[PDB]
Every structure is written in C-alpha cells, then in structure tokens.
C-alpha cells in the first residue's frame, strides 16, 4: 500500500528529535526549554 509513505508520518520526518538536540551545551538546553513558554 502506497499510503504507508505518509500514514503515521508528519510533513517533517527528516531528523530524529534525539539527534536534533544532541550537540547542545547545558546552558543552551536550559535556554531552549525556556523557549517552550514563548512557543505556547
């Protein structure tokens, strides 16, 4: 089935959220978690 190419996948399945955050410093991870208040 062709539908498996998108059923259960967003418009942005191009990097894993484990690997996206992987290289940040401890003060960057703090200031990036603070951004979640502005995003909501």
């Amino acid at each position: 089935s062709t539908f498996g190419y998108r059923r259960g996948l967003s418009k942005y399945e191009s990097i894993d959220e484990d690997e996206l955050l992987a290289s940040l410093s401890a003060e960057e991870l703090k200031e990036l978690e603070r951004e979640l208040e502005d995003i909501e």
Partner: protein, 33 residues
C-alpha cells in the same frame, strides 16, 4: 528537561499531521483525486 523539548516538537508535528489530514479531507470533498 530536553524531554520536554522532544515532547513539544513531536506534539507540534502531530498537530501539523492532524491539520494536513483535515486539508486532505477538505481537498477531497472539493472533488479532487
């Protein structure tokens, strides 16, 4: 922690997926393929 960043990113991707599924519904109801 970084788990909240992962959760909010994956939640925004799920909201985007629900909206793409609603646009896909409405496009099909307009007589598309």
């Amino acid at each position: 922690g970084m788990d909240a960043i992962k959760k909010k990113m994956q939640m925004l991707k799920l909201d985007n997926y629900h909206l793409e599924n609603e646009v896909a519904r409405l496009k099909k109801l307009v007589g598309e393929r």
